[PDB]
């Protein structure tokens, strides 16, 4: 009863091995959903670019025009 | 009298082919003023909404950088 | 008697070039007419470019909208 | 053999605890994060709707005056 003691212990452990266990997988699904968001936003930043520079030419045309003469 | 009339004639012609001339002229002009009036301000009223623009969109880069930090942020 | 045969050689004279002036006024309204035309569809099509382009950014809108609310 | 098995699993065990409340704390920065990430994002969705009405706005005035043939 002090092969009992052993007993809880590796019993203890189990579950803290089990426990652990329940934790990577949620950490490794956080970093996962992380990667896909922030890949998302990084793919709006690059739709933006593209056409912000477009909306530029445009505004330059405009410009251009209002500035012409006789 | 025998025909120094038919070239007083000859003149008061001309006077009227000219009168004519001008009061077609002093309207010309007139439209002529209305058409760079009006391009005036369609120039103006496009540069303002051009102006306008850019503020809007110098506005929409900060944005377009932010969300790039974002996307980076390690 | 010659006296105003002048005064017609003359009126030859500043009705040949009122009739140029005036076909040329003329012409500066017809071209101006033309650019205003073409200014006014320049204009146009600039308008027609940036709703294409308005329609696309709130599309971008409502993702990230989306991305915001989604709750995992 | 005995007095042993139980010196070991004090510290295998007492270890395993702290990389546990490790993961739940590194897990809790990942929420935390998430939520802020996400409301910057929603930060940017919201500056966008207000500024894209304007831009329909400035569109419009646009569209007026290439119509205005009178």
């Known amino acids: 009863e002090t ?5 809880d212990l590796e ?4 579950e803290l ?5 329940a934790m990577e997988r949620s950490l490794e699904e956080a970093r996962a959903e992380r990667e896909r968001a922030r890949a998302e936003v990084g793919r709006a930043a690059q739709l933006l670019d593209v056409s912000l520079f477009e909306l530029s030419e445009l505004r330059e045309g405009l410009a251009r025009l209002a500035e012409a003469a006789p």
Chains 1, 4 share one sequence.
């Open 17 to 21: 091995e089990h426990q652990l266990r």
């Open 3 to 7: 092969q009992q003691k052993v007993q």
């Open 11 to 14: 019993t203890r452990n189990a």
